[PDB]
Design a protein around this ligand. Sequence first.
Ligand SMILES: [Zn+2]
Ligand SMILES: [Zn+2]
Length: 185
Amino acid sequence: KIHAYTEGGKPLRTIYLPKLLKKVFLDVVKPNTKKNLETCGILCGKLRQNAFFITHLVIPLQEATSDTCGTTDEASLFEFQDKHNLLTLGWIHTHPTQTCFMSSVDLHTHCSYQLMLPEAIAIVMAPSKNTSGIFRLLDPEGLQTIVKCRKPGLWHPHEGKVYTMVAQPGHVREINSKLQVVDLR
Ligand SMILES: [Zn+2]
Ligand SMILES: [Zn+2]
C-alpha cells in the first residue's frame, strides 16, 4: 500500500507500533519526569511477514540526568530479549521540560540502533509540551556524519542535515496491537 525508502533508496520495512505505547511509557516513568530526569525505554518485537511488530516496551536499569539517560546493565536487558527472542526495533525517551527534537547525544545514541537495523526509530516524548516525534538519521548521509564525528563534549553541533521525521504510516504505523511493559529497574 504505502512503502517508505531511505535517502539512498533502500526500502524500509513497516514497523507496527501499539497506539498505547507512548502513553504507558509516560506513565511508567512519570516519577522520573517529575524530578525533571530523563528516562529511556527499548522498543522490542518480532519480524513477521516482512514487517516488524513492537510487542514489548522494556525499561532497562539505567542512569539519568536532566538531558541524558543510558542503560547501565545491558546484561539483564540482553538476557530478557534473548529469552523472548526479541529484536531491538528502536528506543523511546523523555525530554521532561524541552521541546521534542534529537539532541547531539540522541543522534550518537541512535546511530548504534540504525546501524544494526535500517528501520530503527527514536521516539521522543516532550510531556511538558504535550508533543512527541518519531525520528531517524538520514541514510546514508546522517549515519555517515555521526560516525565521522569526533567532536568533544556532550552538546556539540553537527554540520548539515543529519536527521528527519519517520514516514507515518509508511515506515511507522500506530495500530491496535498487544503490548507488554517490562520494568527491569
Ligand atoms: Zn533527547
Ligand atoms: Zn557528534
